[PDB]
Structure 1
Amino acid sequence: MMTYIVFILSIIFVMGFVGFSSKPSPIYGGLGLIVSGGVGCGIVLNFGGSFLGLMVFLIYLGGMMVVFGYTTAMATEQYPEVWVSNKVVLGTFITGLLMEFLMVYYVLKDKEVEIVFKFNGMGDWVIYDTGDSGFFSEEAMGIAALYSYGTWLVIVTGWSLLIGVVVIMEITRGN
């Protein structure tokens, strides 16, 4: 019956992520953010990527954990804001969800949406793999090239991460 399920997961992703981006208190922001991260992991897992989405969900999660620790630490009100608490946040949430449902309407019941490109509005079973003989689940080797051919790239990556560590240490020390 349903077929657009990747697009529908994208719609849920954009709803939660716009309510994220409308800036309420970071508690509710993180709630909508982890909802968005989980359904984005579902998008990329259902699209063909095996582990990369579950990986990035884990990483992004741990980032949001530390972000929650610091928003408990520093930014607290006498009573923090929710989506339905203040005028401006409520207006932004309604208007963002309005633009979302309007795009849903122009994709579903119309032909073409031309805001920045002439996006072909139909279902995303196209384009897709036409049953090619993988036998090794392409993205696994596609990440496994990083230690085979990836000489210079992980050198500068680890070097910049080491510099990131000492940078955080010296900015905290510089009192």
Structure 2
Amino acid sequence: YIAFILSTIFVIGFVGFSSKPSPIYGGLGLIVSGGVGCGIVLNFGGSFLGLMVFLIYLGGMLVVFGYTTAMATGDWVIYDTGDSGFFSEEAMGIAALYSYGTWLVIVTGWSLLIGVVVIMEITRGN
């Protein structure tokens, strides 16, 4: 029940940072929770998505959160049976974004450009 143990820890870290003590410490709790969740995804078989959590989430977004704060004051049964061939299905589905998800790429890129513009306009001040 390794997966279950990870899940219990995940919930404990969530309870820890959800009490909202000293937002720096809440950020540390959320960092620990994100690490445990990435471990859950990695142990499941989603290597790329777990590493995406670990890189994007932890190293960009929580890093920016901590920077802004610093400026201020049962298992194993439901699994498959066969194999995936000579590739990983998760990588194929993720790479299908450029061949199948043209609409998704268009809307996401437009949203990100609009987000840059919006951030600049909001922080302008005056």
TM above 0.5, one fold? Answer: yes
Deviation at 1:31, TM superposition (A): 1.0
Measured against aligned partners, the alpha-carbon deviations of 1:83-111 in whole angstroms (never above 9, x if no partner) come to xxxxxxxxxxxxxxxxxxxxxxxxxxxxx
Equivalents in 1 of 2:40, 2:47: separation in Å? Answer: 11
Deviation at 1:159, TM superposition (A): 0.3
Structure 1 residues 127 and 170, CA, compared in 2 at 3 Å: closer, same or farther?
same
Deviation at 1:58, TM superposition (A): 1.4
Any stretches of 5+ residues in structure 1 without a counterpart?
Answer: 76-122
Deviation at 1:67, TM superposition (A): 4.4
Structure 1 residues 32 and 61, CA, compared in 2 at 3 Å: closer, same or farther?
same
**Equivalent residue for 2:64?**
67
Equivalents in 2 of 1:66, 1:133: separation in Å? Answer: 36
Deviation at 1:32, TM superposition (A): 1.0
The CA RMSD measured in Å over matched residues stands at: 1.8
Contact kept in structure 2, 1:26 and 1:71, CA below 8 Å: no
**Residue correspondences, number:** 125
TM-score (norm: length of structure 2): 0.88
Deviation at 1:62, TM superposition (A): 3.1
Contact kept in structure 2, 1:20 and 1:30, CA below 8 Å: yes
Q: Percent identity?
A: 97
TM-score (norm: length of structure 1): 0.65
Deviation at 1:157, TM superposition (A): 0.3
Equivalents in 2 of 1:147, 1:141: separation in Å? Answer: 11
> What SS does the aligned partner of 2:47 have?
coil
**Equivalent residue for 2:77?**
126
Contact kept in structure 1, 2:31 and 2:62, CA below 8 Å: no
